[PDB]
Nucleic acid binder design. Sequence first.
RNA 1: GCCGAUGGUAGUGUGGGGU
RNA 2: CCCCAUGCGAGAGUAGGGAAC
Length: 185
Amino acid sequence: MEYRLKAYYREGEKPSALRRAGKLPGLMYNRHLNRKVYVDLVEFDKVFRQASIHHVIVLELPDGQSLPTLVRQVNLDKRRRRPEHVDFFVLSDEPVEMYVPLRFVGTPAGVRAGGVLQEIHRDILVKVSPRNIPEFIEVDVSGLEIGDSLHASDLKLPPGVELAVSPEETIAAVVPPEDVEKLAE
RNA sequence: GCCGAUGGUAGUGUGGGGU
RNA sequence: CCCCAUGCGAGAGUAGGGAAC
Ligand SMILES: [Mg+2]
Ligand SMILES: [Mg+2]
Ligand SMILES: [Mg+2]
Ligand SMILES: [Mg+2]
Ligand SMILES: [Mg+2]
Ligand SMILES: [Mg+2]
């Protein structure tokens, strides 16, 4: 899934003025470029709600140029729920680190035994070329027995995608019942 | 658990203005 | 305190680097 968004450059125009004018200040960069830009907040909110930091957002620049990007950061004005600044990591020719969602599948054999399944991670940090960005990484936990742990090194990675975290990183585990992470009593 | 921008923000110097 | 103008500018995070592959 890929998205589009119109971006415009900026120089002297003050951030507070831009925000006031319904625009969101921000900037795009990579080992090659760095340029101050801005985008309409409503457009962004609409787009980011679908792309987040997992899908490529194509920025339509004034110079008719288009840049494939990934949202790297969104500074929220403290004391509210609203973006005050955003970073766009411009995808290039080299691989990049990024967060891919994990899609857990299957019921742990240890869960059939009354065990408790715990998904420690929701997303995983992997390294990959913009060409091979995966939509999600499926994770089958049907094998987990009470007291087991699926580690990053256990994840079945797509061709081109590799771990950007320690192989020993715990992705999931199945723990024994009778309270095993506090008990609402 | 190293170095580290730019951008934005907090804070702030000076001048002016204003609930 | 807020805004405008003008000069600085963190902390935390990101790019990039170091290290590693
Ligand atoms: Mg002071
Ligand atoms: Mg700065
Ligand atoms: Mg800093
Ligand atoms: Mg790094
Ligand atoms: Mg090797
Ligand atoms: Mg490397």
